[PDB]
Ligand binder design. Structure first.
Ligand SMILES: CN[C@@H]1[C@@H](O)[C@@H](O[C@@H]2[C@@H](O)[C@H](O[C@H]3O[C@H](CNCc4c(COP(=O)(O)O)cnc(C)c4O)[C@@H](O)[C@H](O)[C@H]3N)[C@@H](N)C[C@H]2N)OC[C@]1(C)O
Ligand SMILES: CN[C@@H]1[C@@H](O)[C@@H](O[C@@H]2[C@@H](O)[C@H](O[C@H]3O[C@H](CNCc4c(COP(=O)(O)O)cnc(C)c4O)[C@@H](O)[C@H](O)[C@H]3N)[C@@H](N)C[C@H]2N)OC[C@]1(C)O
Lengths: 408, 408
């Protein structure tokens, strides 16, 4: 009631935050003792599992100053910077506490280095007001043009390339395919405009590297997969585009628990093994759930893969009913957005989650059988999870109509 | 070569970061095993002491999932928000990961609510480019006017109050006193312009509250004293001025180790006990050092008090020799800036530090006996620590001369 902010978190049907007392692996316990399976995982930043013991031991030693203190440089920092450069590439690297701060700092630096006013953007880049706009496809008061992953609009803006400082995108892989990325990179290379890959969510999510070799980013940002939820974001790329980062310093720069969590987590994510385990387990859950709904006439499908997926519901009434039924079974989904299992989502948890889905499907069967997913269902669902337009065939006038329906 | 940023940290005479491989309480250990006494304390954010055991145990349990998960609201968050409001006042409260992020967010929010373009500013508010300017006393490209704590310039701008959204200051108490704050508040009340008290450094520093009852802030920010170095900043104040905070959310909002550090630290800082202990211990060190230098003819005085103080050297050559002698004895000062002891600066550590100061004084004796502390010495020393002009009597023409000397 005192809070001036509106943090994203699980909320009940009345909008009140759901409180959880404790967590271990994939399971959360609520104040009433009920155990829930977490698919939200701090918005995808818990990738190893809640309370992971190896990370916890490193955090605990760091909380006692055993490898360094917040006052000063220590060998842990050298190790972390080297790990980031090895896995993501680039001339130089930088560190931040949030993805929002990293994206603002990098975008300002690139704009300054390029001495150009316009930035073309798709995807969410954090809460800073520099990204706010009243309308898509036109510059906001900060010179940023939201293009909603529409390549026709992008090509239009890139046809006059001399004023375009950069193109910044948060890559989606549920609704954008290989053809989208090949054309995106062709267009940006043709205009000679640097690409900023905002991989806060997808960097290290699917493999031990950035999300797609079909992008050639001049600058990257990663964060959620770096530190099992501890507040660390990293950036890197071409030195001349990041020169202004020399002006960046913050009080908690050397704080040791954050670096302990990042070095320990990154070492495991750099092997690719957690992402392979998550992919297999999540794929099993997706296949079971898709069939459970399809075999009961429930108009809900899924997009994505085991590492990152989402539910696609026929309409908002179906989605609301699904979310209520899922919560009643103790499934904790990121409602209307993407689901991101952690490595603690093992076969035993998959089996538990599938039984809960069987009960969700039972609760919904017979309520919505005469409804079907339409193109509108797909666009609306994708919009909520990846913050722009799915890559489905349409004309320039149809783009305007879809945006008119979905833009708030 | 790898790091694109230039973080503030202790550096040797060649500008290279000093490496410390562990720390505990008031002592840091360098790669050669030598123990130094820390007066920097992560730029004043370690106020209980490195590796404080109560905080460490809480962080460790939080790292094991015992006190909530990053996915959701936890049982302890309400107690954090409630105590922040009890200690600092205000209608509503918000949380951030750095002081830089807090200051940018609240300044943008206040300006938006006031629907006015100009912000008058003194003091450091973080690294964001919105604060960068080429010259003082005139608006930068973001509408920010740096006034260097000069009340004649402030009064001139406040004489056209209709365009002034807010006045944001980082309060200093080494070089600004009752006279300055009484007049600052008189001017801002007369203009009916809200004050943003950037208490990132001084909030909770001197007592269980904000830094001076002579300020009446509409918005406050605290951070360094809140979480023993973990990355937590807090804001609060008038609900309508912070309306835009409803759009603030970030992935790590509920991260449990930060929450454990802030709640455990705030519960202790809210009693006033650490601040009283630091004040007494630091006052003993100041008194000993002032007398040692005065008896040896060493032209170095001190300003401030046990919670936050600085050295005032006659000139840069004296300062350079002082800092080299101090490093040789294992005193780790924040060079040219403020010293901020932690609660680990106990009587035993005071005695050790006084012995090291005895050796510093002996090493400086006879080298600078013919040097006086001028007005130039005081203004230059204060400028480095509190980022503007000390409140010492001066003419308007003298203000121009000082600013011309010290602005870069
Ligand atoms: C007009 N714009 C509309 C807005 O309402 C706004 O909606 C956002 C919504 O996008 C957001 O969800 C997205 O982001 C979360 C969290 N991701 C963070 C992130 C950052 C910032 O990092 P930080 O949190 O500061 O550490 C930077 N870059 C990327 C790629 C990030 O993912 C993701 O978890 C969700 O998957 C993603 N949809 C909501 N959390 C808050 C809403 N206000 O923008 C989109 C919308 C509809 O268009
Ligand atoms: C050449 N011009 C100069 C600028 O470069 C710039 O100088 C700063 C200097 O002020 C800074 O020291 C000050 O700040 C440190 C750290 N305190 C942070 C702080 C914040 C931001 O919090 P965050 O770090 O993001 O968590 C917000 N508000 C306050 C009140 C803060 O203290 C303090 O520890 C020092 O005591 C203080 N002097 C240097 N660390 C870096 C320099 N670049 O601004 C001043 C000057 C003239 O303009």
């Amino acid at each position: 009631k005192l809070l001036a902010q509106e943090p994203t978190c699980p909320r009940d049907a009345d909008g009140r935050p759901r409180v959880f007392v404790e967590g271990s692996g994939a399971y959360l316990t609520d104040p009433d003792g009920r155990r829930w399976i977490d698919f939200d995982n701090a918005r995808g930043s818990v990738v190893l599992g809640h309370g992971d013991e190896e990370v916890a031991e490193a955090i605990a030693r760091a909380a006692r100053g055993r490898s360094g203190v917040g006052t000063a440089w220590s060998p842990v920092l050298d190790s972390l910077l080297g790990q980031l450069q090895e896995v993501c590439g680039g001339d130089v690297v930088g560190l931040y506490r949030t993805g929002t701060a990293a994206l603002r700092s990098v975008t300002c630096a690139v704009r300054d280095a390029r001495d150009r006013s316009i930035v073309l953007s798709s995807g969410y880049h954090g809460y800073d007001p520099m990204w706010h706009c009243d309308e898509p496809f036109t510059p906001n008061q900060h010179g940023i043009v939201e293009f909603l992953f529409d390549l026709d609009v992008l090509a239009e803006w890139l046809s006059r390339p001399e004023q375009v400082a950069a193109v910044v995108i948060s890559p989606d892989h549920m609704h954008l395919g290989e053809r989208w990325y090949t054309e995106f990179t062709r267009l940006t290379k043709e205009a000679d405009v640097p690409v900023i890959a905002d991989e806060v969510k997808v960097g290290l999510r699917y493999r031990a590297g950035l999300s797609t070799p079909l992008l050639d980013p001049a600058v990257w940002i990663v964060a959620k997969c770096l530190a099992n939820g501890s507040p660390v974001a990293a950036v890197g790329g071409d030195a001349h585009l990041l020169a202004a980062l020399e002006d960046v310093s913050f009080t908690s720069y050397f704080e040791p628990t954050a670096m302990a969590a990042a070095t320990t987590t990154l070492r495991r994510m750099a092997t690719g093994e957690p992402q392979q385990a998550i992919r297999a387990a999540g794929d099993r859950f997706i296949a079971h759930t898709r069939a459970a709904f399809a075999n009961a006439g429930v108009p809900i499908d899924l997009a994505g893969n085991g590492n990152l997926f989402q539910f696609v519901c026929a309409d908002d009434e179906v989605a609301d009913a699904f979310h209520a039924a899922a919560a009643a079974e103790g499934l904790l989904f990121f409602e209307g957005d993407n689901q991101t299992p952690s490595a603690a989502f093992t076969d035993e948890v998959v089996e538990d989650a599938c039984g809960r889905i069987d009960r969700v499907s039972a609760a919904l069967t017979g309520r919505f059988t005469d409804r079907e997913l339409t193109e509108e269902s797909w666009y609306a669902s994708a919009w909520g999870a990846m913050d722009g337009l799915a890559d489905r065939p349409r004309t320039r006038e149809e783009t305007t109509a879809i945006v008119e329906r979905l833009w708030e």
